Design a protein around this ligand. Structure first.
Ligand SMILES: CC(C)[C@H](O)C(=O)O
Ligand SMILES: CC(C)[C@H](O)C(=O)O
Ligand SMILES: CC(C)[C@H](O)C(=O)O
Ligand SMILES: CC(C)[C@H](O)C(=O)O
Lengths: 275, 277, 279, 282
């Protein structure tokens, strides 16, 4: 029933559209995506799944009730200037761009019509397999039903919860960048399996399965990750020997460093944008 | 499903792995909790308390578990295996499939002990992990000298009900131990640290734990469902000049990859040690 | 309301551990100082002068300690134990319970020496630590081949009066040595360093020592009285974006956890070495 | 005992970990009845809130009700929230109130500046305590404000002494105390988790390793508190020549163990000064 549009036809638009249609919450023919470079492979992949495509951002606005801004953050101000006069009372504008504040979006759109309905979200690529992690904050003029609607839609493709907007840059450093930390870890674990004699294909499968199962255990347990760790570690055994070498390298500190670096870079980029 | 029609399972050991497998098997609906028996020298453990509430029959006598079981899981520390085999070895019958879950303990060592009692013991060596409790385990197995072809198939059916399962040659199992056997502990360490990072940057602990676990689960599922190399999936996350590539740099500067290689290696080498002694 | 009216305790050795146990036992009220005897080859020790103030009986001669005592603590350095056993082996009687506190020294080695003189020596191996002096020790023990069930129950009753005490299998004792035997030294090092940190940030040394020690005492008590994982208690300290989580990050960046694992391992390995050199 | 018969009403603005720990400690000490405590929170869905409710503490979403109920009012919210709180309930602070700020870094001066716009002589005490008040072994320091009476400081010390060590300090020491004993229990929990991992590596069951390590730390801390000897002298007494302990102390030294704990106290103290200097600019 709902009309959804994507300004930007890149990886996030594809991941969301694929997740939404796989969830059955949207029909692909009721989704429109716009792109300045109608030659990207994501544009061909979106066409393959049945999404309507166009090179005119104005056409996406006119087709859509819910409008996802899935362009790079530095492109958001240009998009808002281009379509701001075409936003109407019915529109919910959902910015997925890292760093970009609700304030900055509302300021641009309010020059055209007052009370723009804005939602800011931070999600990640695993929405493509319906296991995303999404947070959102509601704007000044977002109606109560707007937030509930967005949580219903985004919950179909993974975890979703409302947050205060000032948490979103930190979320970006944790679950926004998080999949890349995991892909790095899985490549390295597979290298370790190969060093010890496993075929690469088996090593990749087992490492990914180990990470998936541990993550699901933690999500389904009431227990602290340290207690679950204690349960793996038999006295004098193989696991506790491996945990020691992780500790000796400061493994934990590197992951803290990563979340911090991603969060700080997100803040830094938006400070550059506000100036 | 005919494999599991009237099959009885027994656990020698009532620790973390016996609970995890029993919880996995029952949640999968392949075996009924009362068709499972576990034996422990210390009934005062927390795992023994949960198994009891599950409906799993407990006993202090390993011989009772052997007589009641068709498939017999050995879920004890590797150094107890030869003392267990001496105890119940005269009770192992031709009908038994003995599944050793101990790290390092070789099929050959088990067959040598049991062949002194009856000449063709059916032995399978297995390496699994605790996420079988949520039916997302990672399991490999190797079949012994006298294991029948249906024994391997039954093993694969049973262990596939609680996660990934594949047959391997036995000489890969120590390496699998270092990767997916110990793997969940690396992940739990990583998730604790990632949550600490979220807390440092201002998130509540409960939200940080949930987001980090969901990110890891989703990334792992993406890789399992993709034909692309993990490096290509990584490249797709990292926009030029962006937050993710800045974070990946600090991981690289601390040798993040080498620590995980070190871990797989250290767990595998310890597993070889536990066998050689 | 515990008191061992028929027990005479002897210490061979009058060093730190003998004083600590005698002080703990007497402060607990379970033993009168005059029913305790200690022997030492160096009668001019600081710990010897302190035992005398408590009223403990002192003698230079280990044979007198043996003759006076029913429960005999061997509180000497590990390499001295075999010389001690040769010296008093012929004086061990049926009534004696020999409690070895020496790190590394196996029940088997003690029983082999003593059995040359009289079969069936009653031997218990103990690993305890200096905080027994304030009745907050951590003690494990393992019972020997010829120790009766009541011997272990008695020693657990005695050692529980000065702290935590539990029976373990003997093959755990070298690892316990690396954890709770050496543990108090790890804590004293940490408390000195924490106080230096407080002083760097402007606190008087005396206050910094007091606050750091109270922080460690309270946290340890919290964990002992809680069913929660130390990571959960840690999480409760750490407010988002706050002071504590910033400090935890710098501990992690230096591999703080790995150093403590290194320490337990090094103490345990050295304990195993010392014994393997003895045999 | 003398405090119990004072029949004091206590309020907490904030119903998080510190409010729970102090409420738990005060009620376990017998100085306060649980139902004489009221706590408020903008989020009533917290686990600490449910624990307070089970204890019998009164809970309300309205800070004004906590203020009106209280004689001693603890501010147990995050530092950046304190000025919003003071704006909200400043007009409700009465001459009879003692206002006790627990927030890291927040200065007496900043609190008095807000509250003085309403009544002229707000009685303010700044304290830094820690979570082991829950087992009555906290470490607490406090500094008295401009208008706190001598009886106010003495009442504060009596109250906080019921749940651990408590002493008055000059306010300029509190940021350093925060880095030492405020954050200190988290350093100890990290150390205990690691020591237990070490015990497990060397073959102990986890439960025993946790118990032994915590007992070792408790006993050592108590030894130091009851000794007039330097911690280096107590360390020397543990370490027999050539023995296991001195080998372990060497590997601690080779990793810079001492420097890491100095780094920790410094980092916590510096962050505490930043939390204030940030809010000061704002
Ligand atoms: C089986 C293995 C992975 C076990 O967890 C160990 O730590 O030895
Ligand atoms: C979503 C965000 C974290 C993206 O990965 C980036 O680096 O811009
Ligand atoms: C140390 C205290 C003030 C609190 O635990 C924090 O981390 O801010
Ligand atoms: C028994 C051991 C812990 C003692 O401290 C030593 O170093 O010999």
């Amino acid at each position: 029933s709902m009309s959804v549009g994507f300004i930007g036809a890149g990886q996030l638009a594809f991941a969301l559209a694929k997740g939404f249609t796989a969830a059955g919450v949207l029909a692909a023919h009721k989704i429109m995506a716009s792109s300045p470079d109608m030659d990207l492979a994501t544009v061909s992949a979106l066409r393959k799944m049945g999404v309507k495509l166009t090179p005119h951002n104005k056409e996406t606005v006119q087709h859509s009730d819910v409008l996802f801004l899935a362009v790079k953050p530095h492109i958001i101000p240009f998009i808002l200037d281009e379509i701001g006069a075409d936003i109407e009372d019915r529109h919910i504008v959902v910015s997925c761009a890292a760093g970009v504040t609700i304030s900055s979006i509302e300021k641009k759109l309010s020059a055209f019509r007052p009370a723009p309905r804005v939602i800011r979200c931070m999600t990640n690529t695993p929405v493509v397999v319906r296991e995303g992690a999404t947070v959102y904050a509601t704007g000044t003029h977002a109606q109560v039903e707007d937030g509930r609607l967005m949580e219903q839609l985004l919950s179909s493709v993974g975890f979703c919860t409302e947050v205060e907007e000032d948490l979103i840059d930190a979320v970006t450093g944790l679950s926004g960048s998080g999949p890349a930390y995991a892909f790095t870890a899985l490549d390295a674990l597979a290298d370790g399996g190969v060093k010890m004699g496993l075929p690469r294909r088996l090593a990749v499968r087992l490492g990914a399965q180990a990470l998936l199962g541990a993550a699901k255990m933690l999500l389904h347990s009431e227990q602290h990750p340290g207690q679950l760790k204690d349960n793996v570690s038999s006295p004098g055994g193989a696991t506790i020997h491996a945990l020691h070498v992780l500790e000796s390298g400061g493994f934990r500190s590197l992951l803290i460093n990563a979340v911090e670096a991603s969060c700080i870079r997100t803040r830094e980029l938006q400070s550059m944008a506000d100036q």
